[PDB]
Structures are given as structure tokens and as C-alpha cells.
Design a protein around this ligand. Sequence first.
Ligand SMILES: Cc1cc(CCCCCCCOc2ccc(C3=N[C@@H](C)CO3)cc2)on1
Lengths: 40, 40, 255, 236, 236, 59, 273
Amino acid sequence: INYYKDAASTSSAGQSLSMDPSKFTEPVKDLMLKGAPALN
Amino acid sequence: INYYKDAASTSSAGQSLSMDPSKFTEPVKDLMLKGAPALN
Amino acid sequence: GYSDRVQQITLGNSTITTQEAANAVVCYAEWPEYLPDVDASDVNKTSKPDTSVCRFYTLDSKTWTTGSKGWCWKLPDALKDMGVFGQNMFFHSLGRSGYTVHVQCNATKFHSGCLLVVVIPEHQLASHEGGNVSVKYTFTHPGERGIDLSSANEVGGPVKDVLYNMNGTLLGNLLIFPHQFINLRTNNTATIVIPYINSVPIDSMTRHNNVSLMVIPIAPLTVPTGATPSLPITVTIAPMCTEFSGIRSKSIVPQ
Amino acid sequence: GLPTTTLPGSGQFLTTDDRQSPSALPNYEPTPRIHIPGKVHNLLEIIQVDTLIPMNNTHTKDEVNSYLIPLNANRQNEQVFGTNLFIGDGVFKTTLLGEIVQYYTHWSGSLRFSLMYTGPALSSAKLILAYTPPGARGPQDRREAMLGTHVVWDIGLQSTIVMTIPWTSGVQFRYTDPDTYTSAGFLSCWYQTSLILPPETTGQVYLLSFISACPDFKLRLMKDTQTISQTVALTE
Amino acid sequence: GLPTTTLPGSGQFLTTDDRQSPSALPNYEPTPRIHIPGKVHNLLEIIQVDTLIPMNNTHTKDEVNSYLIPLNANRQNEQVFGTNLFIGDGVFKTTLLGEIVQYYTHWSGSLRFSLMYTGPALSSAKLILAYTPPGARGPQDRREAMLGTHVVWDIGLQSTIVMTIPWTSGVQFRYTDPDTYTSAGFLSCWYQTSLILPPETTGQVYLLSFISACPDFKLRLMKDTQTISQTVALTE
Amino acid sequence: GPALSSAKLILAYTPPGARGPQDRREAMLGTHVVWDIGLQSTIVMTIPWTSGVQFRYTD
Amino acid sequence: TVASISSGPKHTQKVPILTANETGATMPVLPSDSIETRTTYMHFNGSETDVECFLGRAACVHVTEIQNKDATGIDNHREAKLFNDWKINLSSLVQLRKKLELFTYVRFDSEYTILATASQPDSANYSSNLVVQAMYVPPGAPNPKEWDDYTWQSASNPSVFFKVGDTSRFSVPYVGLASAYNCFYDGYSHDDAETQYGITVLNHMGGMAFRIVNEHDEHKTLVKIRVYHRAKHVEAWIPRAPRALPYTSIGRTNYPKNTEPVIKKRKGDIKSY
Ligand SMILES: Cc1cc(CCCCCCCOc2ccc(C3=N[C@@H](C)CO3)cc2)on1
């Protein structure tokens, strides 16, 4: 129950439960498959 | 009504109403019947 | 014609027969079983030597005399040197096991005496010094010799006072632990099956013992007239469902 | 803004109340439970396991020997032991039963008292155990004893005898702590015929005695035990 | 007026509680969000990116050189480097992994340790990396090392080797801060055959080493980092 | 022995490859049976066929 | 539920009262196996003996003390009680300890209540109003050195601020590393020849730090902190024999030497009533 009118006044947000490290761990242009050779 | 998000914050648990003394009072391998001889 | 009385336990390449048993206890009514995945944490596949480790090792014999106070062995310590069980033990980082314990003591229908055979999960001993003196490692790792409660206090060792279970509790209440009596007039062996009991799924076999087996004379031994005043007590123990994990170099432990 | 009124008791801390609180560690994930044999749910589960009674209390420092009730060969008509039934005191007090009863104020229910015989197998004996319900004195001779709850025990192959002290009471609860009004009786044991040892044998034989509660049992109104105290906080 | 009672804790301020508050700026409209590449949702997302470990810690002032593990041509049987695995201390401590682990009290999971070789293309080498699970000492020679988790690495076209320290543990969580009971092992590396340089070439070659966490990883119970402190408030 | 006596013996079979055991500790690590002397007068130990080669010479 | 059924005379070959205790069992014998009984009902459930109930009331687990005074020229705040600290633990006081050690492993959430009262033992014009700040300093995180260090910023560490005279209350989930807390541990932290034995090595819970936020007034004020702990959501495994001798140390089983006989000696015979 929100007792207040504005959105800033609500409690903390709830877990992204998004999670996708590939923008950080695999930003390569041509896709690399694990097990296939790195450099062909 | 829980007012809080986490489970630790809820009140005391409610009675097991489990109760089974046999693990402590009769841990024998071959079942003993009351009234039958203890050692055959 | 089956009696509670006669029994055979075959485990590995070794068999025990008793013709004067008094049933057998299975701690907490649970039988040893391997470690389920749902309970697993370490990702390593474990090693299950099976029949080469799950057989019966008979420790060296003790001598019950009228002055005996009782003896105490720790597991897996007592077996730290038995065959391949022991090797596996020093060579893996983690291991887990249940046991069948069979304590033997026969006499005649003229003797009297009664031993308590009890298994205590997590038996943390007390220092006889009091205060917060610790009990050094070696002292709680007697190996197959076990601890002799009628031996003298030593320094860095535990207290050996029987009315207090080596920890500040009374002998009389040890009966809350899985146990069985050997009453010469009834019984000649005691058998207890121990499931693996711990707060972690698998642990180190050398830094932590998870049960102490204790044999304590309670009704003093009384032999017939002009009999030799003593009887030997033998302890045979078999690891069961043993699993080892995290193999490597081979632990080096104090002393 | 909703109008409220606060009642007497606001702000008090009652150690026995049960309410919700904010978690200091928001979102933390506890370690998974694994299976461990032995879970206890009720103290009523454990007081049904029997434990030994130091009945032979006559020593002067605690010894393994006060658990042993001695028996003499060839005595006739005589008395083996006696005790009142104040389960919260005296012989009972250090037993697991005694020890738990002391966490509660009131108890009601039946008790199970058993004796296991340890003499040579070629000996024999007949004993009488008697429960004397509140209202009479501890019996002074078997004749007196045998007129109340009793069991003739014949020592045989079957080593133990289980006597029950059935709940005999006006009032439905008794205090654990020794109350008169609330008192429960006496328990005595006498030779029915007599212990007889085989040839080549000699001396005293002993009985071990246990106590546990019947499934009948009720304990209520928790309190603090006289069995433990301290003078300064402990440290590591 | 509805009757209420206030409980213990009323009026306290717990920095970790999460409740509603009045907005000081009623009706204000925040700037629209535009799209920005790079959004982070979990710290678990970022500790999977590998970063360099200053393994060569032997210097006396921080230098680019403590990131370089040197290799010597023609040595046989010998040891390249050694370290314990206290991820919250020592070599690991300044790495991104080390740096985040320090915001939490407990960690569990697998680690990924990789080595990228930088020697001339016409050279060759075979190294062994070994993980020693808790319970034994840091290995003292390859024979000792090779009996635990290990990978023979053959230096080739493929420049990096990724070793995983699989989670080997009794207890399901370890403290980040150096605990004994909770300790994780050792990591060592030795020549399997030996580094060989081509003609016209000379000197030391170096390996770069990285650390990142496997998707396996768990961190819990947030706390304050020993990695930052201050004596007076800063100003502009 | 007399009926009123009692005894517990261990019989051990030691498969080829080791020496005749020199003490029970050594003996108990191979095929063995703890025999408890009772009402049942005989104990039957089996020497199970332990062998690489499928036949042995009698001689 | 019947507490006793009706039962009459018996003359059988089936004797439920003869057993063999050597087996380790406690055979479930009842009054009706050996006397003639009448029906009676239980009228009772055993509610208040549930382990949740037994361990579920607040117990005092710790009393400490800090003072508000001028720190000018104090070389060791910790030592002046300018801010004490407590090595969280649950065996320092014994009433609750004996209760928990009836079990080997125990698992529960904790609810803490902290009462703080002030004392002004020497001449003050008044009673000041102090705010206490208790911090959770888990192991691995900077521990406070002065009563006003950067540590107290507590940007990542849960802290509660309440007033002396009031009470603070919050609840912490089960923070154990394993599946349960060990009430006992017959092990070491490693196979060292001299390492400590016990649980001291296992129950590594870190400490909790208290301080007054207020600067000093002209008089000195003693604030004494009492921490209460209530177990909620209790789970207990493997019952053990109750503690008989007195305790000497947090985390070891050790009892004092030349202790006194714990079993009361009879005033009379074995035969006495
Ligand atoms: C502000 C603020 C302060 C705090 C404290 C957080 C609680 C951390 C303590 C965790 C629980 O600690 C223990 C310690 C020991 C035992 C225990 N020892 C054995 C005898 C049994 O149980 C259980 C919990 O949180 N926020």
C-alpha cells in the first residue's frame, strides 16, 4: 500500500533479476564459441 | 499480515505438532513388539 | 528359529557371526546412505572404493578388570591406519562415512558385569585444567589405541573422569545417545549402525572426528571364584557407504 | 493521517511476546538445509527415552556406584531401596526426566520405572516393587508395601522389568518443585523370596534402575531451572 | 480513534530498513531517461569479467612489473610462481574480484584463473598449473603438485589457458577475510618441459595472469571494505 | 569344549601375494570370519577362489 | 485423545512388562499394561514444550557498558569505554546456554532487543539525552578505532541509532556458514599441533560495536547496554545429556577443578524415604 502520492516516496525497488554479463564479458563483434578455436 | 519483506522478520513459527519419539526410544534394527519376548 | 540373538553381518570380504546378540541399534533410526546431489556443494565427482574400504577392521583388544574405568575411541581416527580406508583418508581433502560398530565380550554364566556401549555425535572433550585450557590435537587423536579413562591426566590432554562423560554431563544420561548394554548374563556383543551426522555435507577426516564410541563398565566385572579376574573386550568397526573427494597430495598431521 | 490512541503497555518489552521486526540484513540468502538424522520437535519426545537414576545416593562424592543398587544373597522379607517420588528433587533430579521437568512448573502423567538385573545368569531372585499413592507413609515392611500398586518381578532370561507409576491424583497437576498438597507417593522394593547365587560365586549383585515418562505425560508453565547459575559472565 | 500499542524498537533508525517517506518536492517531474549503453544490474555481472593479478608482488613500490610473471629459458622441473587462495587478501586483493569480494562477508563458487603467454611466436613451452585443495601444504615440487587439480598447458597459437579452481569444500561458504577453517588451498605453476627461445632471441619472457569468477559464484552478507578510509571530511 | 565355556575366534584367508600373517592385525585385513562359539557348534569358512590364472597345479 | 483406556484383569502368556534394556530401546509401557485402568482423556497437546516455544523467548545474552565523556587526551578510546565492542557469541551467559546445549546442531533466525539505561554516579545538573549507535562489524570489515572514526559512517554495514532508556529491535536471518550452528564441535580449524580445540574456531560471527553519538556534556554519563536474544524459526537436531557441572569458558566444555558433587547425598539409607 503506498500512503503517499509521489513515486519517489515508495520503498526500495525489488530485484532486477535481470543479469546479463555478456555486454561486459563478451563484447566481441564476431561470436566466439567455447571449444572452437579462438583464432581461425 | 507480514509487514516486512524478508522471512527472518516474521514472528515465531507455530507448533511442529510433529512428535515421533521412536527415533530416540526404539532405534532397534529388528522391530520389537510389546508383549512378545524381548530376546527369542 | 530366527532369534534376535544370532546374527551375521557380511561387509566386503569380512563376516561376523554372533550367537548372543541383543538386537542392534541404528542411530536415530537411519541407515548409512551416500550423499545426494540435492545436498551436495563441492563440484568434484567423489570416489567410492566400496569393498576395499567397507569391510571390518578389528582394533587391538582391551582388558576389563575390576579396576577399569572405560575407554573412548574417536571416528574416523580409530581407523586412520586401517588398510586402504586410511590411505584414502590422508590422500583426499574431504571424505564421508557411516559405520557398523560391533563390540565383543564373552564370559560364562557365573560372571556378572555390564558395559554401556554408546555413540556420541560431536563429543567435544573438556580440558582437566579448567578455565579455557584447550585439549591438544594429539590428545584427541589417539588412533586405534583410543583413550583409556583410567590413565592419568596428561598436559594438553582431556579430563578422564567417568561420572562426567569427559565434558560436564552425567554418566547416567548418556542413555539419550544411541547405545546398547553388554550384560554378561544376557548379551555378549553390542552392534550399532551409525549414519553420517554432520552440519555440512562432507568434511575433513583429519581435523574433525564426528563420533566417539565409548565402552564403560557400569556394573563391575565379578568373576567366579578363583577365576582370573579379567576379560578382554574387542572392538571391530567397518566403514560403510564411504566416499572420498578432493584428491591430491596427502595430508601431514601433527605428531 | 488516521487518528489513534495508545494503550497502557505501549513501549514495554515483554521477553515472551512474538512480533515482526525489520531484518538488519535485507535480502541475504541463508545456507541451504541438508538432511541431518535426529531432529527433535518436542521436549515430550525426549523425556520418553529412559536414563539411569543414581538411586544409591549414599556416597559422599559423585561416583559410578550410586547408579548401582546392591542386592544381598539369602536375605528374606527385607527391603532393597526406598525413595519418595519428588521427580524434581533427590534421586530423580539429575536424570534427563528430572532435568527437563525442572524447566516447567507443573507436571501430570504416568512414570515408567524399570530395573535391569545384572547378576550371574545361574542365579535367581524374586523381588516386589510397590508404588504407595499419596496419603500413607513410605511402607515399613512388605506387608504394608504389598497393599498398594506392586509387581512381583521374577528374574529370568528377560533381564528388565518395567513398573509404571500410574497417575493417582485428585488435583490434575502437581508442581515439580516439592509441594506437600501436591505430593505423589513413595516407591519401595523388597525381596519376594530372595536372591540365590550359584556355586563358585560370591558377593553382591546389582540392579541398574531407569526412569522415563509415559506418553500420558504433560508439563506446563515454563520457568528457569535451579540447576544452573553463575557469578560473572564467561569469556573466551 | 483506533486503539494501538507501540512495540520495542519504536523510534529507532536502522540504516537497512526500507519504508515509505513523504516527498519533499511534491509533484516534481524528473528528467526523462534516455538510453545509455552499459547498464549494470548485479555485482555478479561484473565479477565475471577478468582483470590482471599483480602476481609478481615482490617489488617495493607499485609498478607495471608486478603484473608480469617472468619465465626463464631452458630451466627444467622448476617452479614458476605460487600463491595461496585468500581471494580477499594478498595478490587478489586489488583485482576487481578481490575488490568486490571485500564488500561481502562470505563467498562460495568456482574461480577462473587464466595465463596469457607473451613470448616470441617462434618459442615454445609446456607448463603445468596445479590447484591444491585445502588440507595439504603448498606443493614443494611438481611431483607433489601434479597429484591435485592440474592442467598441462601447451603454448601455441592459442595464447591463453583458462584454469578453473573448482569449488572444493566441506562447508558451503568461506569468509573473504582470511579464515583458517575456511581456507581454500594453493595455486602453483611449474615447467612441464621448459621454455625454449628461437635463435637471435634472448632473455626473459612474461606471462600475464587474470582472475574472474565462474557463474557458480555466490557472495553474501554485505559489509564495509577495509580498502578505503579517511581522517577528515573532504571539501571542494 | 564344555558347554558352559565361551570363545570368539577369527579365521583369516590371506590371498596370494602377501606373507602368512604375523599377528591378527595383519590377518584381519584379508578374508576373515569372527566365529562366536555357541549352541551351533561348527563354523564354515569358505576360501573363495582368488586368482589371476584360472587353474593352479595341485603339486 | 485418550490418556488411558479402560483395561481389566489379565492372566496371559503375553507379558508386556518384561523386556531386555540391553537392546537400547525404551519399550512403550503404559499404566494399563500392569494395573486395571478406566478411560480418561488427555485434554492437552504439548504445545509449550515445542522447541520453537522452548527457545523462543528473549534471554539476556550480554551486558556491556560505554561512557560519554570528554575524549580530549584519551589515547585509547576503546580502553576508556568511549565505545565498547562485543565479540558476538551466545554462550557468555548461562541460562540460555544450558537450554541450547540440550541439542548438538541448532538453526534459527535471531531477534535482538537492546535496552540501554543511563547512570550518573557523580554529581550532574541533569540527565542528558544520548543516542546510542550499535554497528554490526562482521569479520573483514574495519573495526573502529576511535569513537568517531570513518568506520561509524557504516555505509555498507547495518547500524541502528536509538535513545538511551529506549530499546532497539531488529532481527537477523540465520547467518551460519553451514546448514546449522554447531553447539559442539570435536575438531580443529586445521591439523595444527597447537591450534585451539572447540567451536571458538567455527562460531566466527564477528563482533558488534556500540558508542554514544553525543559529544560530551560537563558531567560524565555511564550507559550500560543489555542485549536480549530470541530464537525464531527454530530447528534442533540430536538431543544430548544436560549440562551437570558449572561452565568456565565460552566455547569449551571444560568444568572447574574440585567442583562439588552434583548428585545430592541421601540423609539416610538407600532404604530411606
Ligand atoms: C545494527 C545491527 C547489529 C546486528 C547484529 C547482527 C547479528 C549477527 C549475529 C548472528 C547470530 O550469532 C550467533 C552466534 C552464536 C550462535 C550459537 N552458538 C552456539 C552455542 C549456538 O548458537 C548463534 C548465533 O545487526 N544489525
